[PDB]
Design a protein around this nucleic acid. Structure first.
Ligand SMILES: [Mg+2]
Ligand SMILES: [Mg+2]
Ligand SMILES: [Mg+2]
Ligand SMILES: [Mg+2]
Ligand SMILES: [Mg+2]
Ligand SMILES: [Mg+2]
Ligand SMILES: [Mg+2]
Ligand SMILES: [Mg+2]
Ligand SMILES: [Mg+2]
Ligand SMILES: [Mg+2]
Ligand SMILES: [Mg+2]
Ligand SMILES: [Mg+2]
Ligand SMILES: [Mg+2]
Ligand SMILES: [Mg+2]
Ligand SMILES: [Mg+2]
Ligand SMILES: [Mg+2]
Ligand SMILES: [Mg+2]
Ligand SMILES: [Mg+2]
Ligand SMILES: [Mg+2]
Lengths: 116, 94, 58, 77, 136
RNA sequence: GUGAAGAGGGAAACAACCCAGACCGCCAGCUAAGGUCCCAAAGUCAUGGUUAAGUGGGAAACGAUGUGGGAAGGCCCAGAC
RNA sequence: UCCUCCUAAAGAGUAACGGAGGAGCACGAAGGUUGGCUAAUCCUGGUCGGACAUCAGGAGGUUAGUGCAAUGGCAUAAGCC
RNA sequence: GCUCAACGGAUAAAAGGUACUCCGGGGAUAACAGGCUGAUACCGCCCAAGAGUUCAUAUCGACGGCGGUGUUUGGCACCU
RNA sequence: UGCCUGGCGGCCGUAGCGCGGUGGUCCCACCUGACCCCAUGCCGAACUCAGAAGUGAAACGCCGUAGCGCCGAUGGUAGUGUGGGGUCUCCCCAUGCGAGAGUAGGGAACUGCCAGGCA
């Protein structure tokens, strides 16, 4: 399995963020898309979600699923969660190496007012 | 073709079972899935003589409790460890 | 509401320490002593514990 | 014949504060050798796997986990 | 002489002997010699009662021994004071509770089986009885 | 748990076992363990059975047409042993 | 003198000239953190090659591993880079 | 800076003979005798493979089992 | 409101493995290419970047099937606290608690928060 090996590759960081009782910004990546959503410290319910599959974001994007696309969703997540009062989150890799579109997804969200 | 008479046990447990066994009777139960199980008591000397027959465990038996005939089949038998006696016999409502 | 009468009929010389305390809980002092206690599931739990030295009339 | 007669002092392990007990902060809950009881919510873990409180409350034992492992937590009640 | 090879430990606690036995029915053959008493039954009595059985029938049937000692018994030497270690293991016994089926054999008429088991029941300390196969 | 540091009654006698905890006196009553034929206080008490051994009132593997009770079995007045 | 298991009677503790084994160290990385990885044993196929080296598939599942005895533990790995 | 390892470590520094012996104590503890036990010892019995020309029990009796006595060698340390 | 799909949990085998069928508009998955951002103790196999041609084969989801896994009564048995008793190296009686194994059977999950596509 290619996904199961990644899931156990992100368990340690994901359970520490729950024991820490901190809001986290989980990031899911696909060869054709990229997703992001802010999940409450409970872990069961979400507060804010923005992704490339959203039609309000994809129509302005030449090809959803590249670095320039990951920068646009990160800005969307940060501004959406800014009016909700969420400012202090913690980034969750979800097993992906913090090197490509996830880095741009975080960097653009970080620059758009979110503090993590 | 084997017909055996039994009565419904008023009291059950470890203490009440050993009083039954000292009076030449031993407990038994009848369970058949879609009906509630029925705990009965029946004499020991009568049923020990029939259970020696090879056909006891194969043939469908008949139990007369409260006047009603219940057709059963012998499922399991609990024997005394070192005596020619019985302790408990399971009838399934077949 | 209803009172219950307990009488001690056997001595407490060589009894377990958990049965000497139950008699103190009930209030019995010597064999033949009769006390009138309130009826209660807790009180009747002491009578059951020592129901070989006490005799309850009812 | 002989060549025996050795032992070690008992380490006095075991649960110290059982379930439902009101503990303070930092009070030891269970002394263990391996990890028989895993740290849950509001309890820590020593270098020798001793489980200690981190906030005053009532102890709780639970069996959360995919592998059905005993967990110890604290309710700030 | 029945005796375990490659035991985990040389010497074993005395222990006790309570309760009824587990193998209380004939499962391999058709006639069985069932105990009614209680007490340890050494490996020397197991072989002495097997010889008296493979000689009464002497040509026919198989014989199953449903017991195995696997219990070391240690005896102190003579003119030795108490203490200073445990005794050195001497023989092996098979703890027997009532209901245990010791021997059993198939392939002979019941009359020959009944008499053959009587020749072995006179070499075992415990009080044994003859039992036949059932149906369940 | 008792003795040690606890007497009293019982187990013939018998610190530990069973009953029971002595502040003192009484020529008063009811009981516990244990007992009621005489020694020695109290049933030669009542009903229904067992034992023939003084078993009761020392001990096993094993042996036996001792004797009482219970459920079945084989043969038998086309006559059993 | 110290450490691990049993005796130790499911909290702690618990003895014998009771039943079994270890220690008087090691490491400047064998510690910290970040990133990554998952074994034993089997089958089949394959040059030297062989019951057993290295390789490719499948079953298996931690029956492997832990600087050092035993117990408890470990996949979020405390095991391996 | 201590195998002060007899590891809560009497000194910085230490082996023996006594039948030539002596004092304070102990039946808290051994040798003799007694006592409890009976592994061991002696005696007896149960089953019967065989020996006995046939035939197990005239006479023995293997492999095993069950007891008695308190006469051996022992165990304990209750009395002195 | 309904169906399909993705993310995060709850719950932990009645929830997993096996056998068969089915799904590609969207989603997911395989996939094309590699100078570049990054990587292989060799290999873009994995990780990663740039895209969309092909496919639903593998994987994944869903549905069906009990061959295993798993859950599992009633009755009885073992054990045992207290109080009595025996022929007391083991048991019995009164009473309270009452397994394990096995039998009948159950059974191929249920559910919460968001985000897409369709009707
Ligand atoms: Mg006295
Ligand atoms: Mg007197
Ligand atoms: Mg007084
Ligand atoms: Mg009177
Ligand atoms: Mg008189
Ligand atoms: Mg006499
Ligand atoms: Mg303990
Ligand atoms: Mg205990
Ligand atoms: Mg003590
Ligand atoms: Mg290490
Ligand atoms: Mg790591
Ligand atoms: Mg490490
Ligand atoms: Mg010292
Ligand atoms: Mg000193
Ligand atoms: Mg001289
Ligand atoms: Mg001289
Ligand atoms: Mg002197
Ligand atoms: Mg003395
Ligand atoms: Mg002494």
């Amino acid at each position: 399995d290619k996904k199961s090996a990644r899931i156990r590759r992100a368990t340690r960081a994901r359970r520490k963020l729950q024991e820490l009782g901190a809001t986290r910004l989980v990031v899911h990546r696909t060869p054709r898309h990229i997703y992001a959503q802010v999940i409450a410290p409970n872990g069961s319910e979400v507060l804010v979600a923005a992704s490339t599959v959203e039609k309000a974001i994809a129509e302005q994007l030449k090809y959803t699923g590249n670095k320039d696309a990951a920068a646009a969703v990160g800005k969307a997540v940060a501004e959406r969660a800014l009016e909700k009062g969420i400012k202090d989150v913690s980034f969750d890799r979800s097993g992906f190496q913090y090197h490509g579109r996830v880095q741009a997804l975080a960097d653009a969200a970080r620059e758009a007012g979110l503090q993590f | 073709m084997f017909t055996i008479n039994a009565e419904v046990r008023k009291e059950q447990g470890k203490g009440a079972s050993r009083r039954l066994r000292a009076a030449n009777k031993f407990p038994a139960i009848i369970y058949g899935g879609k009906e509630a199980p029925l705990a009965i008591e029946l004499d020991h000397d009568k049923v020990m003589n029939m259970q020696a027959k090879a056909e006891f465990y194969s043939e469908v038996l008949t139990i007369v409790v409260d006047g009603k005939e219940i057709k059963v089949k012998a499922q399991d038998v609990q024997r005394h460890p070192y005596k020619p006696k019985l302790q408990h016999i399971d009838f399934v409502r077949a | 509401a209803k009172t219950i009468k307990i009488t001690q009929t056997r001595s407490a010389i060589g009894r377990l320490p958990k049965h000497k305390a139950t008699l103190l809980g009930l209030g019995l002092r010597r064999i033949g002593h009769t006390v009138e206690r309130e009826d209660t599931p807790a009180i009747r739990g002491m009578i059951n514990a020592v129901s070989f030295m006490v005799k309850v009339e009812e | 014949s002989t060549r025996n007669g050795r032992d070690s002092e008992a380490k006095r392990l075991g649960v110290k504060r059982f379930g439902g007990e009101s503990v303070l902060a930092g009070s030891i809950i269970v002394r263990q050798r391996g990890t028989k009881f895993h740290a849950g919510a509001n309890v820590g873990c020593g270098r020798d796997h001793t489980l200690f409180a981190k906030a005053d409350g009532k102890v709780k034992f639970e069996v959360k986990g995919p592998k059905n492992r005993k967990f110890i937590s604290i309710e700030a009640e | 002489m029945l005796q375990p090879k490659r035991t985990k430990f040389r010497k074993m606690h005395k222990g006790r002997n309570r309760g009824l036995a587990q193998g209380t029915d004939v499962s391999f053959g058709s006639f069985g010699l069932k105990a009614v008493g209680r007490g340890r039954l050494t490996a020397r009595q197991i072989e002495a009662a097997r010889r008296a059985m493979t000689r009464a029938v002497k040509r026919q049937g198989k014989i199953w021994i449903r017991v195995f000692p696997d219990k070391p018994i240690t005896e102190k030497p003579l003119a030795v004071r108490m203490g200073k270690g445990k005794g050195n293991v001497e023989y092996w016994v098979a703890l027997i509770q009532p209901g245990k089926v010791l021997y059993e054999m198939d392939g002979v008429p019941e009359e020959l089986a009944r008499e053959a088991f009587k020749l072995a029941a006179a070499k075992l300390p415990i009080k044994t009885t003859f039992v036949t196969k059932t149906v369940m």
